[PDB]
């Protein structure tokens, strides 16, 4: 349930929250928000396990 963004185009200003998350594009092979090549999602989960 706890997640953390892993991809973005620009960095953040100090104390900046941004929620808008489409399928990130890792350079070329345009993602068009259609999850093509180089398309990883910024949403990443942790391994919070006992």
């Amino acid at each position: 349930n706890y997640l953390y963004r892993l991809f973005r185009k620009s960095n953040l200003k100090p104390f900046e929250r941004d929620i808008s998350t489409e399928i990130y594009q890792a350079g070329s092979t345009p993602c068009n928000g259609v999850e093509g090549f180089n398309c990883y999602f910024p949403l990443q989960s942790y391994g919070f396990q006992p």
Binding site: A26, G27, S28, F37
Partner: protein, 50 residues
């Protein structure tokens, strides 16, 4: 098992040269994002093509 480790050098590196003549299946470089691999100034890359 007999993969060649060869030094190629005395020239200029590149990254976008792989988007015109090679129809890709996978394109992964870990430890450094492939994007900067054009400007990256390598020191006698031990080329392993197989």
């Amino acid at each position: 098992y007999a993969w060649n480790r060869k030094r190629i050098s005395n020239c200029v590196a590149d990254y976008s040269v792989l988007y015109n003549s090679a129809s890709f299946s996978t394109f992964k470089c870990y430890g450094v994002s492939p994007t900067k691999l054009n400007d990256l100034c390598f020191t006698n890359v031990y080329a392993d093509s197989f």
